[PDB]
Amino acid sequence: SDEEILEKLRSIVSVGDPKKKYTRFEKIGQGASGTVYTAMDVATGQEVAIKQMNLQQQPKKELIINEILVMRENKNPNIVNYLDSYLVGDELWVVMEYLAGGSLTDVVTETCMDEGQIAAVCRECLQALEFLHSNQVIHRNIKSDNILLGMDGSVKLTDFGFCAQITPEQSKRSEMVGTPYWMAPEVVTRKAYGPKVDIWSLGIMAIEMIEGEPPYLNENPLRALYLIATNGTPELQNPEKLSAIFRDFLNRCLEMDVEKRGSAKELLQHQFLKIAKPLSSLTPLIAAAKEATKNNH
Amino acid sequence: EKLRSIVSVGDPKKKYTRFEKIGQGASGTVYTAMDVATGQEVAIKQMNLQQQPKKELIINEILVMRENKNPNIVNYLDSYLVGDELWVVMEYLAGGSLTDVVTETCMDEGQIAAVCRECLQALEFLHSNQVIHRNIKSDNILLGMDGSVKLTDFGFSKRSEMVGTPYWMAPEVVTRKAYGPKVDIWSLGIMAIEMIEGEPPYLNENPLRALYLIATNGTPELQNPEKLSAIFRDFLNRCLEMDVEKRGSAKELLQHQFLKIAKPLSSLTPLIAAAKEATK
Numbered sequence: 312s313d314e315e316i317l318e319k320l321r322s323i324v325s326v327g328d329p330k331k332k333y334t335r336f337e338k339i340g341q342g343a344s345g346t347v348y349t350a351m352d353v354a355t356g357q358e359v360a361i362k363q364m365n366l367q368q369q370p371k372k373e374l375i376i377n378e379i380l381v382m383r384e385n386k387n388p389n390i391v392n393y394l395d396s397y398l399v400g401d402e403l404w405v406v407m408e409y410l411a412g413g414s415l416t417d418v419v420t421e422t423c424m425d426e427g428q429i430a431a432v433c434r435e436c437l438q439a440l441e442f443l444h445s446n447q448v449i450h451r452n453i454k455s456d457n458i459l460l461g462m463d464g465s466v467k468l469t470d471f472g473f474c475a476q477i478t479p480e481q482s483k484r485s486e487m488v489g490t491p492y493w494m495a496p497e498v499v500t501r502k503a504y505g506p507k508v509d510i511w512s513l514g515i516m517a518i519e520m521i522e523g524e525p526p527y528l529n530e531n532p533l534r535a536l537y538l539i540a541t542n543g544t545p546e547l548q549n550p551e552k553l554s555a556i557f558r559d560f561l562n563r564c565l566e567m568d569v570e571k572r573g574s575a576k577e578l579l580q581h582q583f584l585k586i587a588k589p590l591s592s593l594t595p596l597i598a599a600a601k602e603a604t605k606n607n608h
Numbered sequence: 609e610k611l612r613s614i615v616s617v618g619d620p621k622k623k624y625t626r627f628e629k630i631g632q633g634a635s636g637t638v639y640t641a642m643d644v645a646t647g648q649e650v651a652i653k654q655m656n657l658q659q660q661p662k663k664e665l666i667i668n669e670i671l672v673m674r675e676n677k678n679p680n681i682v683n684y685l686d687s688y689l690v691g692d693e694l695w696v697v698m699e700y701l702a703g704g705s706l707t708d709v710v711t712e713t714c715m716d717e718g719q720i721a722a723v724c725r726e727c728l729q730a731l732e733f734l735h736s737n738q739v740i741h742r743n744i745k746s747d748n749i750l751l752g753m754d755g756s757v758k759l760t761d762f763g764f765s766k767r768s769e770m771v772g773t774p775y776w777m778a779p780e781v782v783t784r785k786a787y788g789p790k791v792d793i794w795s796l797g798i799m800a801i802e803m804i805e806g807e808p809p810y811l812n813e814n815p816l817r818a819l820y821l822i823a824t825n826g827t828p829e830l831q832n833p834e835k836l837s838a839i840f841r842d843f844l845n846r847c848l849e850m851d852v853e854k855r856g857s858a859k860e861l862l863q864h865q866f867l868k869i870a871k872p873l874s875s876l877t878p879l880i881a882a883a884k885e886a887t888k
């Protein structure tokens with residue numbers, strides 16, 4: 312049972328010493344998921360992110376299994392990719408690409424993004440979603456916190472532990488999975504749902520880019536769930552500040568009718584993306600976010 | 609140097625032997641060990657109070673426990689600075705957690721009443737001192753080999769995902785309201801349901817769904833309400849009132865008739881024996 316799922320996790324990870332391939336371990340953060348380090352590939356110089364986890368103390372090992380399996384099977388330039396993993400006794404070490412630009416959350420909460428920068432971020436995220444959905448993977452937890460940026464402005468999606476794999480005989484899910492403020496109404500109300508819930512969450516992330524927060528953030532998560540179920544498509548504070556094409560893009564992401572809501576493939580053709588600036592335009596925002604997050608300290 | 613007032617001067621490596629690791633937490637590493645002069649088993653938590661955020665709260669918490677001991681709270685013994693590590697020494701309760709008993713035995717109402725009474729005595733003590741425990745649940749109730757029942761301590765982001773289910777939390781907690789001591793009475797009611805049903809409520813629910821159910825239904829639905837006596841069901845109703853003013857206080861519930869069917873605490877030691885056999 313519980314020992315069974317533990318041995319199932321252990322069987323998919325090679326037994327070895329992470330110190331033979333990686334060096335320069337330096338701690339950058341601690342979560343309930345474990346300790347996160349940066350490190351360096353000793354042969355190539357690649358900087359990597361390594362999370363250290365005590366399996367004896369992980370609550371939901373089945374989730375770790377799913378995330379590792381999904382990452383191994385779905386590599387893509389717009390995803391924070393899995394590199395390697397190691398079993399060290401009762402410790403699991405997971406090696407991922409390292410994104411030195413920080414999270415999109417730091418940018419949206421500390422800067423003003425123009426529509427060309429927002430369009431660039433949206434296009435990179437839609438490229439990841441088109442790839443994932445074409446492979447029957449639904450992320451279900453899209454938010455700025457799970458978008459990481461490279462020092463060159465690259466944009467990549469991370470944190471797949473809430474994801475779902477759909478199949479022909481089970482092409483929809485029904486569970487209230489996600490982070491409340493970003494969840495689509497059909498998820499909040501426990502209706503059958505599919506990949507377009509990620510498109511809804513992307514729409515909420517575009518509201519983050521415009522306003523600095525998802526709708527209802529000042530409310531408790533349960534109250535926010537109630538507001539999503541009862542309001543449906545959220546209101547912008549100042550819609551008149553948006554271009555006509557940006558408003559149309561938002562409307563298509565946040566459509567209540569799932570049939571009418573855009574697919575990732577469809578939204579990659581939207582006129583709004585054609586005003587996208589090059590990804591280098593994001594590096595001044597990264598610099599501002601880093602400065603701001605050292606002055607809040 | 610308030611630390612010096614709470615730190616004994618001896619060498620704990622001389623005073624204790626047979627160190628055995630039994631867990632790793634965010635607060636530090638917990639070992640079992642034995643007093644070399646008396647044979648008492650102890651639990652020792654090792655924490656590097658080396659600029660760990662908000663060390664003063666950890667320090668003051670220790671100060672509070674030394675001055676405010678209680679028969680139904682795990683007794684604090686001593687603490688030592690061992691190379692800028694703080695070792696906190698507690699009595700060890702070798703009967704294990706209530707969780708192991710609940711999952712490996714079926715408790716009868718007399719055994720449940722006894723556990724509830726002992727926990728209510730601890731809560732009356734804490735509440736009289738304006739302490740809210742906030743985590744009354746089966747893995748924080750420890751059992752002695754004589755059937756003693758004790759709480760392990762005083763209780764010590766909107767943007768983040770919920771991974772586990774806070775099944776013990778009162779509705780006023782989950783709705784992020786200001787709350788008081790009676791949230792512990794709610795959690796006790798949930799634990800009594802756990803004891804009679806063998807598992808915590810909401811086990812098959814997603815955390816967000818369980819949060820909504822707690823906020824709106826309040827009490828979880830009993831799986832088999834017909835199996836509970838009238839007096840036990842009334843006790844549960846008094847613990848699980850949604851109206852905070854109507855919910856019983858610890859002092860009030862210590863007078864409830866359900867507690868008067870309590871078996872002697874010795875009746876718990878066969879449960880401990882079963883749990884150890886089942887988990888070994």
Ligand SMILES: CCNc1ncc2cc(-c3ccc(N4CCCC4=O)c(F)c3Cl)c(=O)n(CCOCCN)c2n1
Nearest residue numbers: 347360361362378379405407408409410413414469470
């Ligand atoms: C912002 C600094 N740059 C950065 N660049 C990459 C990562 C990768 C990761 C990561 C993701 C996933 C797993 N995986 C995959 C299998 C199970 C598992 O845990 C992992 F090990 C790791 Cl290290 C991570 O956490 N962080 C910390 C910040 O993350 C924000 C979202 N929480 C990262 N930060």
Ligand SMILES: CCNc1ncc2cc(-c3ccc(N4CCCC4=O)c(F)c3Cl)c(=O)n(CCOCCN)c2n1
Nearest residue numbers: 638651652653696698699700701704705747748760761
């Ligand atoms: C069931 C095995 N028996 C047992 N018998 C006693 C304890 C005492 C303790 C403890 C309590 C409190 C502090 N204190 C007091 C001041 C700050 C602090 O940390 C402490 F250090 C320690 Cl060691 C502890 O942890 N555990 C591990 C299991 O606990 C379950 C709940 N998590 C114990 N197990």
